[model samples]
Target chain A: TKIFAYAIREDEKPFLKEWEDAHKDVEVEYTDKLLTPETVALAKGADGVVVYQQLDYIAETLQALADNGITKMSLRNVGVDNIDMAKAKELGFQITNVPVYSPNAIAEHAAIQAARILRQDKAMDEKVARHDLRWAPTIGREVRDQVVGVVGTGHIGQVFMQIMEGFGAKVITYDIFRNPELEKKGYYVDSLDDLYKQADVISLHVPDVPANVHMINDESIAKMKQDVVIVNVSRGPLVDTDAVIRGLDSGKIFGYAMDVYEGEVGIFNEDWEGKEFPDARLADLIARPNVLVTPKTAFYTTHAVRNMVVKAFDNNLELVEGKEAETPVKV
Target chain B: TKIFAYAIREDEKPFLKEWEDAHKDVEVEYTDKLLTPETVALAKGADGVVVYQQLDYIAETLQALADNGITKMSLRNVGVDNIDMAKAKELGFQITNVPVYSPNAIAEHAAIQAARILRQDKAMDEKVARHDLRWAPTIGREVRDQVVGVVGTGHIGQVFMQIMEGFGAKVITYDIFRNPELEKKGYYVDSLDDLYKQADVISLHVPDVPANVHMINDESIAKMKQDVVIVNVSRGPLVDTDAVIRGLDSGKIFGYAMDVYEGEVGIFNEDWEGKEFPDARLADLIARPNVLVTPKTAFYTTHAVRNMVVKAFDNNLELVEGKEAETPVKV
Candidate 1:
C-alpha cells in the first residue's frame, strides 16, 4: 500500500522517516511543499493523501485529488473548520486528524504565562536593562489563592486542570460536552457566564466553529470580573478581537494572551518589522503590554511536531491497508 | 495574669483588639510606643511582657525589666537571636518567640515570583507603560520542567518543598538539619554545593548566622549553574550582595529575588518611592531587571501577622502562669 504525504516542514522530516522505517511493509513518500491544488497531482499514484496545510481545503484542491483517483485524505493537525466540509462531503473523503497530542505542552505554557503576568517579570527585565534594581510593591500574589476557570474541559483542558490544581489553584471549568471524570471530581461549572464572573484567570481550549466564533464578545467581556486575565491558545476567532481590545482599554481585562489569532495567516510565522503590518487590529493587540501574541506556536514544540508527523503517517499507512487506527475524523 | 504588649503598630490595633476581646479573662494592655529601657517601668504591674521590638534585648534593657519584676518576655515574631542569651539568663527572663507563622504565605510568594521571572511580567508592564506591547520570542518556560533546589528542609522549607512539588517542579533540597520524613524520601543532598550545581532555581529558607552569612559568596556563586535563579526570602545575610552582583554581571545568575536583605530593618515595611533610598547597594539592586527585591514582605500577610500577635500574647500569658510553651527562646 502506498501513502503520500504533503506540506511536511523540514523539522518534521526525521519523524516521518522514522515512521516509514518502522513500517517497512508500507511504501511512504512525502513532500516539504505546502498542499495545494497543483501539489495534489504529486500524490496521484498513492492510495491515500496525508496533508498539513495552513490554507483552507478549497473545492479546486478536492476536485484535483478526485480527478487523480486520490479520494481519501487525512489531516495531521486539528482545526477542521478550515476544510470545506461541504466539498469533502460531496467528494466522500476519508478524513482523520490528530486531535490529541500533548495537552501538557499547551496547558503548562498557559499556566506559566498567567503567573508571569501577575509577577510583572517584563517590568523587572526592563528595569534591569536600564541598570536599576529595587524591591518595592512589586509583590506578586500566589497561584494557590487564585480562582482559575477553564473553558472546554476536553483533553487539553483536563491536562491544564491537573497542572493548575497541582499549583494549588481553585479550578472551575465549564464544558458543553462534559467529561465524566472531571464532573465526578466536581470541577465542572454551570456555564461560561458564571465562569467569567468568578475566575481570576480564564483559559480557552475550545474549538473554532460558527457558534464558538466570537464567543468572547462585548457582552461576555462586560460580564467578566474586572482585572480578569484571559488566555487563548486554542483558536483566535473564538475571541472577539475588538472586544478584547476594548476590554484592555477599559481596564476590564488585566492581561490577554493569544497564541492563535483569527486572521493569523500571512501575518504570523513571518518578519514584518520594517514593512507595514497588514492587520491593524492584530497589530494593536501586539502593541499592548498585557497582550501576548505568539504566532500560533502552542503546537510548535519539537516533541508535538514529531508526534504530528509520525502519527499522521501511521494513520495514512493504516488507511491504505484497510487497518483500523485511532483518531479517525468522521466527516 | 497581666500581659504587657509593647511596640504595637497602628495597623495592628484591630487584630490586637480582637485578640483582647477573645481572651477577656487575661489582662492585656499594649502601648502604641516602641519598648525601650526607659519604658520598662511600665511593665512593673504586669506579670509578663509581649514584645515585638526590632532592637536587640541588650543587657541594660534586660536589667531594667528585672528591676521592674518582669522576668517573662515573649516575642511577637521570630528571631530570638536579637536577645543576649547570657543577659537573659542572668536576669532570669523567660523568653519565647513565634517560631512558625503561615509557611504557605512565604512559600507561595517565592513560587509565584519564580514563575513571574520566567514570564517576564514586569518587563511587559513596562512595555505597556510606554504604550508598546509587541511580543516576539519572549515566551516563558513552564515551571513544570524546571529543577528547583531548596536550601533547608525545616518547617518553612518543607512547606516550600511541597508547594514546589505541587507545581510539578523537580525539587531538590539540601538541609543541615533535615527532616526525618524528608530523609526517608531521599529529598536531601549532602551539601549546598551540590544543589548549586544542579538546580535551575535555588530558594533559600535557611537562617542567617555567622557561619551561614555570605554562604552564597564569590566562591559559592562560581559553582552555581549558569542562569541559576537565586531566591532569598529566608535571610538576606545568607547571600553576599557583592558575590550576587558579580554573578548577575557574569550571567551566572539569571535572576535574583531577595525578600530579606542583611541590613533590611530600616528599609523594609516602609514606603521609599518619591524619596531617596538610603541603602546604596539595595538602590543599585533595585535598578536591575533580573533582580527583584521585596522589603521583607513575604511574612507580612494578615494571617501571619495576626498569628504572630496572638501567639506571642498567648505565650506571654502562659509564661505569666509559669507554663513553658513549645517556642521558648531559652534566653
Candidate 2:
C-alpha cells in the first residue's frame, strides 16, 4: 500500500523517515505543498493520504481526493475544526488525528512561561538588552509564593499543575469534568470565579469550544485578583484580547503569556523578517514588557513532532487495512 | 547613632528605607558615591558604615575612616576580595558581609536559564521577533531527559539542584566540601572529570578562589561530553571565556548561560545601550543563539535585595555595639 503525505515540513523529515523505516510494508510518497485541489493529483495512485494544514479542508478538496479513489485520510494535528466534516461524511472519508502527542510539551511551555512572567523575565530581557543590569525596581517574585490556578484538568492541565507543584507553587484547579485524583485531593475549586479570585497566576488549558470562547472577558477579569497573571496555551478565543488588553492597561492583569492568538491562522508560522509586520496588534503585544507572545509553538517540541508524525501514520495504516484506527474522527 | 552607607543605588532605596524605618533609633545617611578620601568625610559623625563597591578599599581610605573614629563596617554583598584586610586590621576595623541572602534568587536564575537553553527559548524569541513561528527545526528538548552536573553543593548549588530535580532532571554533583546530606545521598561524583563525562548540562556554583579560576578551560572542555551545556552563575573565573567561546565555535559545548564574567567589575551593570558595547568578546557571546548572557544579576531579586540591606544594617549595628557580627570577616 502507498501513502501520500502532504505539507511535510523540514523538521518533520526525520520523524517521517523513522515512521517509513518502521512500516516497511507501506510505500510513502510526500510533498511539501499542502493538499488542495491544485495538489490533489499528487495523491492519485496512493491508497491513503496523511496531511496537515492550517487551511480548511473544504468540500472541493475532499471531492477531488474522493474522485481519485483516496478515501482514507490522517491528520498529524489535533484540530479537526479545519476539516470540512460534512464533505468528508458525504465522500465516505476515513479520518484520524493525533489528538494527544506529548502533553508534557504543551504543559511545560505553559509552566515555563508562567514562571517567566512571575520572575519578570520579559522585563529583565528588555532591560538586559538595554544594558541596565540593576537589581532594585525590577525584582521578581518567587514561583513558590504563587497560588497557581489551572483552568482544566485534562492531560495537559494536569501536567502543568504537576510542574507548578514541583516549583512549590500551590495549585488549585477548575474543570467541568474534574480528575478523580485531583478531586480526592481537594485541588478543585468550586467555581472559575473562586479560582480567579484566589490564584496569583491563572493558566487556561480548555478546548476552544463555543462555551470557552471569551471565558476570560471583562466580567471574569473584574472577578480575578488584582495584578493577576494570565496564561493561555490551550486556544486563542479562550481569552478576549480586548479585555486582556484593558486589564493589562488598568493593572488588573499583571501580565499575559499567550501561545495562541484569536486571529492567528494565517499570521502565525510564517516569516516576515525585515518586512512589514502584518498584524499591528500582535506587534504591539510583542512590544509589551509584561506580555510574552510565543507564536503558538507550545507543542512544537521534537518529542511532540515525532509522536504526531508516527501516530498519524499508524492510524492511517490501520484505516487503509480496513481495521479500526486508534484516534478516528467520526466523519 | 548614625550609619553612613556609600554607593547607594536606586534599587537599594526601598530596602534601606525599610531597614531605617525598622531601626528608628539609628539615623541613616547615604549617597551613590563610593568611599574615597573625598567621600570619607561624609561619614565624619557616623558611628558605622555600610558599603558595596567594585573599587578596592585602599589603605588611605581605611586610614581616612580611622581618622573619623569610625571602625565598624558592613558590606551589602558577599565579596571581600576588594578590601585591604591588612589596612582594615591596622585601623582596628570590624568588617561584616552578607554571605548568603536568597540562594533561591541565584539558583532559580541558573535553573531558568538552563531550561531556557535546553528549550531553545533564545532561538524561539528570535524567530518570534521575525514573525516566523514554524516549528519544524526549532524543536526543544525536555530538561527531564538530561543529567545535570552541579560543580558546587553550596547554598546556591543545592537550591539549583532542587529546582532542576523539580524539573525531573537527574542531578550529579562535585564539591570539595560536600553537604553532609548530599554526600549521604551519593549526589557527589568521584571527581570533576567523572561529572564532565556523565553530565549533559553543567552548572557552576563555586566561589572565585584562585584554585577555581578557569576551571572550565580548554583542558576541562576536552573531558566534557560533546555538546554539553555549561552554566556559570557563581563566578566568571570559574569558566574561562576564551575556552567557552572556542567550545561554542567547535560545537563541543552546546550552550552557555553566564551570569558572571571574569572581567565584569566595570562592565556588567553599566548601561551601554545605543552606544558601542565596550567588550567585543562580551558582545560576541551575547550575539550567539545558544548563549544566555545575564549581567551578573543572579542576586538581583527583591528577596535577595531586602536581605542584603537588612542583614548588612543588622551586622553594622552589632559591630557598633561592640558585639560580634553575624557574618563578620576576620580582619
Candidate 3:
C-alpha cells in the first residue's frame, strides 16, 4: 500500500515524516510541486493521494488522477470549493477533508489583531517608521471597555468569544444555532442589527453561504456604532470591502483588521513588489495606517498545520483500506 | 489663586478646563510653550505651576521659577529624571507626580506584541505589503502554549500577568516585593535563573535603579531559553540595548518589543523623517521585522492622559494650599 501527498511545504515535511514513521505499513512519497493538470502524474502508482492547494481541481486534473487509478483523495484543510466535485463524482472519486483542526488559531489571530487595532499600533508603527513618534492625538483604547459583537457561535466563534472574554471584554453573539451553555448564559443578541448597534468591536466568524455573502454590506455597516473597529477572519465574502472602505473614508470606522478578502485569491500570495498593483482599493487599504491585512492566513500556525497533515493522511489511509473516512466529503 | 500649566497639549485643554470649572476658586491659564529659563516668567503672578515635558528641568529653569515666587510644582507624569532635584530641594520647591495612571494600557500593549511576534505578524505584514502572502514558513505560535515569565510584579506587572493569564499562558514572576495574592498562588519562581531556564517569553516590568540597570544584558540573555522573546515597557535602562541587539543578530532571541530605550530621550518624540538616524543600533531596531518599537508610548492613552491632567492639577492645588499632596515627591 502506498500514499502520495501533493503541494508539500517545507514546514509540513517534518510532520509528514513523523506520520510516515508511525504508518510503517504504508509507503509514502511527496513533492514540493503542486497538483495541476500539468503535474498530476506524480501520483501515478500510489494507492491514495492527499493534497492541499489554492488552485482549482479542474476537470482535466480530476480525469488524470482517475486515469491513474487514484480514486481516494484527501485534503489537508477544510475548504473543498477548489475541487471540481461533479467531475470527481463522475470519475468515482471519494474525498476526505480535515475539519476542526484548531479553532483557537483563528480565534487568537482575530483577538490579537483586534487588540493591535484598538491600540492603533498600525498607525503608530507607520509613524515611528518615519520618526514621527509623538504621543499626542494617537492614543489607544482599552479592550476591557469594548462591547465585542461576535457574528457566529460555532467552534471558531465560541473560541473567539472566549478569548474576548479573557480580555474582560463584554461579548454578545448572534448565531443561527446557539450553544446551550452560551444561550443559558445570555450571550446572544436579539438580531444582527442589535449586535451592530451595541458592539464597539464587531468580529465576523460566519460562513460564506449565499445568505452570509456580503452580510457586512453598506446597509448593515450603517447600524454599527460610530468609530467601531471591525474584524473579519472567517471568510472573505462575508464582508463587502467597498462598504468598509467607505466607512474608513468617512471616519466612521476606527479600524479594520482583515485576514481574508473577497478578491484575495489572485491578489494575495504573490509578490507584486516593484510591479503594478492591480487593485486601487486594496492598494489604499494596504497603504493605510488604520487597516491591518493578513493575506487570508489566520489559520497559518505550526500546531494547525501539523494536525492538518496527520489527520488528512490518516483519513486517506482509512479510505484505501476499504473503511469509512473519518471526515468524508458529504456532497 | 491662579495655577499655570506649561507645554499644555491640545488634548489636555478640555481636562484642565473641566478641573478648573469644578474648582471655581482657582483661575487656570496655560501656554503651549515649554518651561525653560526663557519662558519661566509666565508664572510671575500664578500661585503654583504644573507641567509635562521631556526637556530637562535645569538649574537655570528652577532658579527662574523661584525668582517668580513659584515654589510648588506638579508633573502630569511619573518621571522626575528631568527635574534638578538638588536645585529643587535647595530652593524649597515641592513637587508632586501622577505615578499610577493605567497599567492595562501598557500591559495590553506588551501582551498583544507578544502575540503578534509569536505568530510573526511583522514579517507577514512586510511580506504581504509586497503582495507575497504565501503561508509557507511564516507561521505563528499560540500564546496559550507559551511559558510566560514576568519580572517585577508591581501594579503594572500584575496587570500584565492578568492579561497573559487571560491568554492561558503559564506565568511565573520575580519581584523584590511580592503581591499577596500572586505570592499566595506560588507564581513567583525561586530565582531569576530558574525563570530564565523555564520561560519561553520574558517581560521586564522592573525599574531603572542602579542595581537593576542592564538586567537583560549578555549574561542574562545567555541564561534565557534559546529564541526567547524579551519585552521592556517598564524602564529604558532595565535592558541593555547592545546585548539584546547582539541576541537578535545571533538569533538567540526570538523577538524584541520596546516602548523605551536608554537613548530614547532625543530619538523618540521628535520628527526625524529624512533626517540622519543618529544611532546605528536604534535605526536597525526601528527597521527590523522582528522588533516592535513604540517610542516610549505604552502609556499613551485617552484614559491615561485624562487622568494625568486631572491628577496633576489637583495635586498642584494641594501643594499651593499647604496641605500634604496626595502623591507628593518623597525626597
Which candidate wins on TM-score? 3
Q: How close to the true structure is residue B305 of candidate 3, measured as C-alpha lDDT?
A: 82
The TM-score that candidate 3 achieves is 0.94
Model 2 collision count: 0
The best candidate in terms of DockQ: 3
Reproduced native contacts, each prediction: 0.10, 0.54, 0.73
DockQ winner between candidates 1 and 3: 3
TM-score per candidate: 0.67, 0.92, 0.94
Q: DockQ of every model listed? A: 0.14, 0.55, 0.68
Cα deviation at B63, candidate 1, in Å, is 7.1
lDDT digits (tens) for residues A1-331 of candidate 3: 9999998998898899899999999999999888987677889899999999878998899999888878899999888988898898888899999997788889999999999899988888988888777766778888877999999898889888887887778999999888899999999988899999999999998888899999988899899999899999988999899999999999999999998889887878777878888888787888789899888788888888889999999999999999988999964
Per-residue alpha-carbon lDDT of candidate 3 for residues B1-331, written as tens digits (9 for 90 to 100):
8899999988778888889889999999889999999899999999899999988999999999999989999999998888899999999999999998888778887888888888999999888787766656788888877999999998888888888887778999998787888889999998989999999999988878999999899999999999899999889999889999999999999999999999987778888878887777787898899999888888887778888999999999999888889999854
The C-alpha stretches of model 3 lying farther than 4 A from their native spots are: A37-40
Ranking by DockQ: 3, 2, 1
Output the worst ten-in-a-row residue range by lDDT, candidate 1 chain A: A128-137
Kindly report the docking quality category of candidate 2: medium
Query: What is the descending TM-score order?
Result: 3, 2, 1
What docking grade applies to model 3?
Answer: medium
Q: Rank the candidates by lDDT, best first.
A: 3, 2, 1
